[PDB]
Design a protein around this ligand. Structure first.
Ligand SMILES: N[C@@H](CCC(=O)N[C@@H](CS)C(=O)NCC(=O)O)C(=O)O
Ligand SMILES: N[C@@H](CCC(=O)N[C@@H](CS)C(=O)NCC(=O)O)C(=O)O
Lengths: 223, 224
């Protein structure tokens, strides 16, 4: 087949790509990579970053997950629109996906993984602040409409964010705490539960327990 | 009393992107210079999470993050000067190379030439040459050999994304006490810069490299 995906099973960034592929109804090859022993294929396709995910479409590589998502939407444009119609809402969608990566993850969950003590508590403070902002972002982009970031339509932003729900338990485990979604962030809770009813998400999103084990394994490398 | 307002710092390549893009589309706009030491409440109302420039306000709508702003500008005035390519893949690659300009050439190149000393700075310049090599390649990749732009004959997203750093070359040369061998080792980029500088947009908004250099040196002294 014309389409291949190189990924790490627990990576939210490639899970974006899989979810996106399924939503468009694309059949694809999947190759699991060991980042400790990377395929020459990955190095040939992503020599600059040497990172997953990689999407190979007709042996041409698409790199960096959000761009890949936009690529998928633009490469399979006849159905299932990820992007909004208006420019500004698209700008906001991009802004918020970017925000998910740079803040909720890079300046949140990653530090929960890597950090210890007051640093970790600070990471958790940050995570709550960001999830608050994202709870607000949901009502912003949805226009109050339920239950997705695209209201009734499951879109770019839903795709960018929902794989991190597979990481919540991991974050809870490594920070030894409880994330109060149901109470402090109910829209996101409902949204996750809603997203979990879709075929795509059920097909590709892994069990949180496994991710958590995996995350702990990775935490030991740090701390 | 016009509908587009830009909040910016004059020397930032990232806001210069925005200005260049607006000039290409023929959009008339207000410009507001921000002091990052005393930020306007407006900048804070409009960009409360990052509190950064540039900010583009279009009819009370704040557009944030320079590349996204560039895309917004293209998508909001689409009947005029298309920035983005026709093919999805080339758009994917253009966006990729833009991200590459920000995260590599700058964050892991020029920023470090400003911030660092010794072996670190030396390695930053080594990197800059590597990245500029890759970008010399990027131009031919995306242009299809066609000259003189990243869009061949059309002046686009990546051209806009990259060309404000040309005002920063001289500054990097000074802060690193070296010369970037554009004319010899990256001649496409040389040709491309000179071509882009023939456009009114770029001529209109891009500052003299000398003042950029002074400014860069001052802040380097703040970093020593
Ligand atoms: N910038 C990439 C980030 C991808 C990424 O770094 N994923 C992690 C998952 S933790 C990874 O495995 N990176 C490859 C590596 O370890 O070098 C994107 O937007 O998708
Ligand atoms: N939203 C901006 C972020 C770029 C950025 O970091 N700009 C710098 C100036 S070069 C800034 O605003 N710094 C604010 C500060 O240093 O406090 C973009 O378009 O990329």
């Amino acid at each position: 087949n014309q389409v291949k995906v190189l990924n790490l099973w627990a990576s939210p960034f490639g899970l974006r790509v899989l979810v996106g592929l399924e939503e468009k109804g694309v059949k694809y090859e999947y190759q699991e990579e060991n980042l400790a022993s990377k395929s020459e294929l990955l190095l040939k396709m992503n020599p600059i970053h040497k990172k997953i995910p990689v999407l190979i479409h007709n042996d041409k590589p698409v790199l960096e997950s959000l761009i890949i998502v936009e690529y998928i939407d633009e490469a399979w444009p006849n159905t299932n629109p990820f992007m909004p119609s208006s420019a500004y809402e698209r700008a906001r969608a991009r802004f918020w996906a970017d925000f998910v990566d740079k803040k909720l993850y890079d300046n949140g969950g990653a530090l929960i993984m890597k950090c210890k003590g007051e640093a970790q508590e600070e990471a958790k403070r940050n995570m709550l602040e960001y999830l608050g902002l994202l709870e607000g972002a949901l009502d912003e982009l949805s226009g109050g409409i339920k239950p997705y970031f695209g209201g009734e339509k499951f879109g770019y932003m839903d795709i960018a964010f929902i794989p991190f729900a597979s990481w919540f338990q991991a974050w809870e485990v490594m920070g030894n705490w409880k994330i109060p979604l149901e109470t402090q962030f109910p829209r996101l809770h409902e949204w996750v539960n809603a997203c979990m009813e879709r075929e795509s998400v059920k097909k590709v999103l892994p069990h949180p327990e496994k991710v958590a084990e995996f995350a702990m394994q990775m935490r030991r490398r740090f701390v």
